[PDB]
Ligand binder design. Sequence first.
Ligand SMILES: Nc1nc2c(ncn2[C@@H]2O[C@H](COP(=O)(O)O)[C@@H](O)[C@H]2O)c(=O)[nH]1
Ligand SMILES: [Mg+2]
Ligand SMILES: [Mg+2]
Ligand SMILES: [Mg+2]
Ligand SMILES: [Mg+2]
Ligand SMILES: [Mg+2]
Ligand SMILES: [Mg+2]
Ligand SMILES: [Mg+2]
Ligand SMILES: [Mg+2]
Ligand SMILES: [Mg+2]
Ligand SMILES: [Mg+2]
Ligand SMILES: [Mg+2]
Ligand SMILES: [Mg+2]
Ligand SMILES: [Mg+2]
Ligand SMILES: [Mg+2]
Ligand SMILES: [Mg+2]
Ligand SMILES: [Mg+2]
Ligand SMILES: [Mg+2]
Ligand SMILES: [Mg+2]
Ligand SMILES: [Mg+2]
Ligand SMILES: [Mg+2]
Ligand SMILES: [Mg+2]
Ligand SMILES: [Mg+2]
Ligand SMILES: [Mg+2]
Ligand SMILES: [Mg+2]
Ligand SMILES: [Mg+2]
Ligand SMILES: [Mg+2]
Ligand SMILES: [Mg+2]
Ligand SMILES: [Mg+2]
Lengths: 110, 21, 95, 100, 38, 354, 52, 118
Amino acid sequence: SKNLGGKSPGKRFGIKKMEGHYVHAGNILATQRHFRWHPGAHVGLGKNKCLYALEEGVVRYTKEVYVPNPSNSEAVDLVTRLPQGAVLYKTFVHVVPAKPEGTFKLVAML
Amino acid sequence: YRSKPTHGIGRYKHLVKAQVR
Amino acid sequence: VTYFSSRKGKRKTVKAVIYRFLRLHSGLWLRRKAGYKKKLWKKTAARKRRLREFVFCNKTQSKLLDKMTTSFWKRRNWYADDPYQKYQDRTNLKV
Amino acid sequence: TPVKAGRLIVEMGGRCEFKEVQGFLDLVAHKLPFPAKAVSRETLEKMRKDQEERERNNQNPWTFERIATANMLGIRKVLSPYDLTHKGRYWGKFYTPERV
Amino acid sequence: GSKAVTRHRRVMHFERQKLMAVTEYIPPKPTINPRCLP
Amino acid sequence: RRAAPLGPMPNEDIDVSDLERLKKYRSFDRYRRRAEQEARKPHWWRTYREHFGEESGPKDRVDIGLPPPKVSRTQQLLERKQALRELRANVEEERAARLQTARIPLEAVRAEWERTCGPYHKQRLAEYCGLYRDLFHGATFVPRVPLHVAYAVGEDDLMPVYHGNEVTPTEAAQAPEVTYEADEGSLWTLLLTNLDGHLLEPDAEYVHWLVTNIPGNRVTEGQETCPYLPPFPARGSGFHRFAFLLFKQDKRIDFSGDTRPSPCYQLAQRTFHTFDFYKKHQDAMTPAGLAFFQCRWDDSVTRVFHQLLDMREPVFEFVRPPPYHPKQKRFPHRQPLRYLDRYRDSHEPTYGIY
Amino acid sequence: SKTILVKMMSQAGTGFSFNTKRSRLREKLTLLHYDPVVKKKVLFVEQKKIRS
Amino acid sequence: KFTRSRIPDKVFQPSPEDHEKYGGDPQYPHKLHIVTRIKSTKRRPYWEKDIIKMLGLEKAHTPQVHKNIPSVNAKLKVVKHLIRIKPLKLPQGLPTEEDMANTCLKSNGELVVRWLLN
RNA sequence: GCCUAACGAGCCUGGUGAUAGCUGGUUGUCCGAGAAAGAAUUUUAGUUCAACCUUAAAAAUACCCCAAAAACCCUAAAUUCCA
RNA sequence: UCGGAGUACAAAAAACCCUCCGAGUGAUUUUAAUCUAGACAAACCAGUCAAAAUAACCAUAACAUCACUUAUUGAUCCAAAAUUUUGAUCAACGGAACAAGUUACCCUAGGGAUAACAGCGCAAUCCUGUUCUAGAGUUCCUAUCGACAAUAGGGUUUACGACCU
Ligand SMILES: Nc1nc2c(ncn2[C@@H]2O[C@H](COP(=O)(O)O)[C@@H](O)[C@H]2O)c(=O)[nH]1
Ligand SMILES: [Mg+2]
Ligand SMILES: [Mg+2]
Ligand SMILES: [Mg+2]
Ligand SMILES: [Mg+2]
Ligand SMILES: [Mg+2]
Ligand SMILES: [Mg+2]
Ligand SMILES: [Mg+2]
Ligand SMILES: [Mg+2]
Ligand SMILES: [Mg+2]
Ligand SMILES: [Mg+2]
Ligand SMILES: [Mg+2]
Ligand SMILES: [Mg+2]
Ligand SMILES: [Mg+2]
Ligand SMILES: [Mg+2]
Ligand SMILES: [Mg+2]
Ligand SMILES: [Mg+2]
Ligand SMILES: [Mg+2]
Ligand SMILES: [Mg+2]
Ligand SMILES: [Mg+2]
Ligand SMILES: [Mg+2]
Ligand SMILES: [Mg+2]
Ligand SMILES: [Mg+2]
Ligand SMILES: [Mg+2]
Ligand SMILES: [Mg+2]
Ligand SMILES: [Mg+2]
Ligand SMILES: [Mg+2]
Ligand SMILES: [Mg+2]
Ligand SMILES: [Mg+2]
């Protein structure tokens, strides 16, 4: 007819790990098409806007302030156009590390 | 989320409006 | 697959599986990624690495290949300077 | 133009009484597809207070709102999610003002 | 299978009919008729 | 479904209507300042600090120290304004400022800083390094009096010990000189404590040099309870903290339980708890000076371990946790050939019966 | 505007080729690529045309 | 779509008259629930079937004793349209180890410890 | 059209137990558990996987799941994750 | 065949010969490597990310960038390459290496899983009555009609469905 190509499978864009989930390094916390959840502490950002934990720990979700990069012209312009009392807020995903860095073990008593 | 009390904390499009007689 | 041959009455094997597959003595099967030699200029470096990397087969394909291959290919093999001799066996399988 | 129940269609004013406007508006209300009446501010207020009084002095302890909100008898299996807001007064496009 | 909104009054499921009959309005009836009560 | 916010929303104060009459900030720096100002407030929602350890938020710190110097604020402000006006009246200083050729007497700046606001900076850095977290566990003090500690490397080489400095055991082998201003009517106690280096007890610390009943500034004439011991950190676990604590006392304190022998080479006797020490001497002693420094392992530690302490040198190493691996599957799907190498016991071919 | 597929080899003497999409109306292709055989920043020049 | 039903907390806010209507103590709540299954789980959702299964109410018209804790009260609220719930009454106290074989549960909701004395 | 009562290409024998995703049938008793469809396919009259399910064997967590948490102009019934 | 929006309102998935946008590529230089934890997605094949470590440039980044950036693409085998690559509107796009019409001269195995006739469901269409009065009727809505509209009934025509054969 006139409407063609409307069939396309879903890309499973969603949130994988919720708050309190114990994850390891490299686990993909969430995937998205547009910036819905921003990475925070110990969460990387893949080139397809996916979020993966960098350290092993507990996943948390926090509402925080948004201070954009000065090089991002669109965000900078939005910031300057914001009124005097307005502060941008976003939802960030964090990983609280549970495993210590290491332990000082005795090797040899020389 | 919508059912959470913190819904609409990121609402910013109402703070900037950028789309005589 | 010929379950009963005409000359000897034995069970034959398909040559495609032995040509494009490798069976380890642990029961696993080895195979290459599909499309690792087609249009390398159009693909990303990570995608090319994934194509070049070897992969395994799951239970269903392993059982299919075992059915389609005779027990001669399931024997223990001691080749000289065999790269896969270290992978022939399985260790620390808590099942 | 979609019209719901309880929405005004034509609103009139002036220095006239209610009898004549009701008299020549009842024909329009009847010829309208949905049931309609020629009401005024006083008539609308009177009906709303009458409905409030009826639903407040209802004698039987069992009401559609109570049962639907409490999931008595597992009735939400038969009911619709919009019945929690309709409170049994609206069924499809039909509205019965006598059903509390 | 009919739509949610129809013109034929959408004859209702029996348990909903019973629910409506149970929840029908009951007006308050006084003990003595006040017309020619004192 | 909608829920009511548990408190005031962030941007609910400003009016949405008539935005053109509301002033804006056009500076990314202004927005950054506002954002960092707001980020420090105790919001009712789950913030970053709560999950990443703001250290129990507010803490009512017990103050154990001397009262602050009572200074006449009005006269101090008048003198400061007069000094500023006299400095402003000069024309040569203005010329230097315009021509961008101006210098500052850093020695006088440091002296004035120590005199007026050095104690607060020292206290906050000692917070940051966790001195009070391990010495009193609940109490912070203001180092009101200065404390200049200096080690002598030779005839003309002097290494200062500032708050957080790094001094090697080669420099710290000999007893240091301590200077502080005090009249000839008070008594002081100096205590050098090693916070890290106790092999057995984690909740205990070492003593290196404890001298008590110091008349005024003269530290040598005061009786030394514990003789000086050069620092001995472990080779692996480095950067231990050594703190000189100076206490002012009123009465002539004598103690027979904390007395240490002249050799004092027994680590069993060289085990200390500043909490219990201040509990014992809480009536008279009050901490007024503090100077802590970092110390790592060098070649001189072996001599201390062998000749003095009569022990073998312990060697440590920062070992890392083993990498995490999932449960090995019977039939891994689409996994690389190296999947079997992640669970290999050793890189040695094992022939079972052959 | 049709593109061209060109196979370019290393100028470091070692045999190392890679394919690149180019515009037909451009000059001969010459770039600075990375050679893993010599592990160096190597000038690569056009020699062959594979696909249109 | 037909899904599970959220019951607002206003339903479980007892009125002052409810106590003397249902014979309950307004100030001490009771301790144990006697729960009986009246209706069938047929023509009922699978989650309700699972709740009935985990409450130990497979056989209808057979009472089961449960605690009065919110953990089980949640499931009781979920399947409250299929069960009759009474407070366990102990006119003669808890049965000791010597009265375990001589106990009975009268249909009025009480547990008698001395039943059929000789 | 006709070629021995059926000719858009005779009849017999052999290949031949032709081949049929198509139709029909499939023979004693009792007991246990027990399934209505996601993806490909000259494929939707069928096959091959996945999800279910059956007979055995290893283990340990499995359903219900309070908080807390899951987006930005408005958005209901309610969903996911866990004590 | 592939992607975006609603249907599919809030984790994921979700169809129609459902309503709309597109894609089968262009431009530029920063020409964008090797190896390997751990994960997303998925029947399978495929697609996706990616911590640490190594080679070359600041001795501080390298995910090539932009066009709604999401789609801009194709599996074996085989041919040409010569050390390392490429080759298909295989567009019926999980692709047979290459095969058109007509049969009312037709045949066979099946299907009421699927049409033409009948039956049946609905009443778009058709036919009836009543409600509403502006208007025609020389004045006058209803002697005879009655536009724009309302309610209800019948199952005669065609259409729709594909439930019995
Ligand atoms: N062009 C091309 N032909 C192929 C391929 N694979 C098989 N073929 C077959 O190889 C033959 C090539 O003959 P051509 O069409 O060049 O005269 C055709 O039968 C074609 O179908 C392929 O990958 N590319
Ligand atoms: Mg879609
Ligand atoms: Mg689809
Ligand atoms: Mg009407
Ligand atoms: Mg329906
Ligand atoms: Mg002042
Ligand atoms: Mg014949
Ligand atoms: Mg046959
Ligand atoms: Mg078929
Ligand atoms: Mg059975
Ligand atoms: Mg059945
Ligand atoms: Mg919850
Ligand atoms: Mg759980
Ligand atoms: Mg998965
Ligand atoms: Mg790296
Ligand atoms: Mg096809
Ligand atoms: Mg196909
Ligand atoms: Mg596909
Ligand atoms: Mg003819
Ligand atoms: Mg036939
Ligand atoms: Mg049919
Ligand atoms: Mg069918
Ligand atoms: Mg027809
Ligand atoms: Mg018909
Ligand atoms: Mg019939
Ligand atoms: Mg019809
Ligand atoms: Mg009809
Ligand atoms: Mg007229
Ligand atoms: Mg059908």
